[PDB]
């Protein structure tokens, strides 16, 4: 099994340099799934550097994205990541409207960010779309069950 | 031939027909308006910097 | 000239931002210098004259826009 | 071009309509998983005089073949649903609202009360249609806690 014995979700490596030596593992580069599973893995590492940029400008830049790809943040520790820099945040804010160029920009970059800083304005994709969430959900539980089907024919 | 009953349609084929176009931020429309505006400020205000009230209206002096 | 304005400008609002800045300053500094290049000649020294005439038009409006340039009185 | 937009936003209208009447799941559509047919004949190999290592060749254009009809049966729907969405738009409200462009009169000026109103509905909209209610505690109360602790001793 070698890669194979531990999960898709449950190593040390990233999601998507699993996916890489999971495929590398399982098929020869001359096979199809072999070329579908590196594609998906620029997909997930696409998906890996959306999720450094975000959170790039609380938890610095060795952010660990690991944790958080595995184990995302639930909505209290959104909210409590939203507090721990609102400080920097309102006094940046104060620093660049005092510097913008007219009283037309300064009056903007504190508008957005009274509404930046409010944490009950960051949109949950789960409160929004409560049906689109769901599905997004079962796209994996169904990937998942056509695993658990091939191992009950077996 | 167990790799037959698998779906065909891969998850990579699925992640590019559910994410197919990279979606607007609902920030992109504020900073790209308000930047535009800010030079409908700087013309046409009278109490900007850049105002073309002189230079479209020559002041009679 | 109602007729040329509205065809020059119609042909420019057609044009992205980035194009039109940099096609009027390359044509801003072209003609900067046609006039440096000549020598003393006295309808260079009053083109450069005007230059400079036209940064002050702009930095009196910016000392106080609401009034206007600054004339002697 | 303003007549292109209000066809597309009236179009984007016909979709969101008759796919909210026939309440089919959001991602249902745009996964080709959902076209795929699971009840195909799947052809064995041990019937097409396959060499040594001829079987992984043969597998791929089984599987790409019946990947490739259900992405080929996903443009069949859309290409349909498209001139389903395309009659009711031609039968549509168009009662858009319009771009907030500030108030900009033939001689006149702009005023930086219109300019700022303007900037209030761009930052109106950064707010989600539905939010959680992340409660900040406000320092009004946090500190008529912290020193009913105090005046405890802790």
């Known amino acids: 099994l070698g890669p194979q014995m531990e999960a898709l979700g449950a190593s040390d490596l990233l999601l998507s340099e699993q996916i890489r030596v ?5 098929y020869t580069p001359d096979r199809l799934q072999y070329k579908e599973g590196m594609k998906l893995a620029d997909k997930i590492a696409a998906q890996e550097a959306a999720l450094k940029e975000e959170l790039k400008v609380i938890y610095g830049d060795n952010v660990d994205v690991k944790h ?53 304005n960051i949109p949950f994709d789960e409160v929004l779309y409560p049906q689109l969430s769901e599905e997004l959900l079962e796209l994996e539980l169904s990937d998942i069950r056509e695993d658990e089907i091939a191992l009950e024919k077996a | ?40 400020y700087d013309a046409l205000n009278l109490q900007s910097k850049r105002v073309l009230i002189w230079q479209v209206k020559p002041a009679l002096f | 000239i109602e007729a040329e304005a509205a065809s020059i400008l119609d042909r420019h609002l057609a044009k992205p931002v980035a194009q039109i800045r940099k096609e009027q300053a390359s044509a801003y500094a072209s003609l900067l210098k046609r006039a440096e290049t000549a020598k003393g ?31 002697a009185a | 071009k303003k007549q292109a937009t209000e066809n597309l936003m009236k179009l984007l209208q016909a979709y969101k309509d008759i796919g909210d009447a026939k309440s089919e799941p ?10 795929e047919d699971r009840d195909y004949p799947v052809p064995d ?52 609202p319009r771009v907030a462009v500030p108030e900009w009169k033939k001689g006149k000026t ?43 001793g802790q």
Not at chain 1, 22 to 26: A, D, G, K, Q
Not at chain 4, 80 to 85: F, Q, S, V, Y
Not at chain 4, 118 to 145: C, M, N, S, W
């Open chain 1, 22 to 26: 999971i495929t590398e593992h399982r």
């Open chain 1, 68 to 120: 958080f790809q595995a184990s995302p943040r639930t909505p209290v520790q959104q909210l409590f990541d939203s507090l721990k820099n609102a400080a920097a945040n309102k006094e940046r804010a104060a620093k660049e409207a005092a510097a913008a160029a007219s009283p037309y920009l300064a009056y903007a970059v504190t508008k957005k960010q009274e509404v930046q800083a409010d944490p009950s």
């Open chain 2, 1 to 40: 031939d167990r790799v037959l009953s698998l779906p065909a349609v891969s998850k990579n084929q699925v992640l590019e027909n559910v994410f197919h176009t990279a979606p607007k931020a609902p920030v992109e429309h504020l900073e790209k308006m308000v930047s535009a505006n800010s030079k409908v």
């Open chain 3, 41 to 71: 000649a006295k309808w260079a020294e009053k083109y450069l004259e005007d230059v400079k005439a036209v940064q002050w038009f702009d930095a009196s409006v910016a000392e106080a826009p609401a009034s206007g340039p600054k004339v």
């Open chain 4, 26 to 35: 959001l991602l249902k559509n745009h996964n080709p998983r959902t076209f």
């Open chain 4, 45 to 96: 190999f041990r019937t097409q005089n396959l060499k040594a290592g001829d079987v992984p060749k043969f597998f791929d254009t089984v599987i790409s073949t019946r990947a490739s009809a259900a992405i080929a049966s996903k443009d069949k729907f859309w290409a349909g649903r498209k001139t389903e969405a395309e009659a009711a738009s031609a039968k549509a409200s168009a009662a858009f």
């Open chain 4, 110 to 152: 702009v005023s930086i009360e219109n300019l700022n109103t303007v900037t209030d509905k761009y930052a109106a909209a950064l707010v989600p249609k539905r939010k959680l209610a992340l409660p900040v505690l406000p320092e009004g109360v946090k500190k008529a806690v912290e020193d009913f602790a105090a005046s405890v």
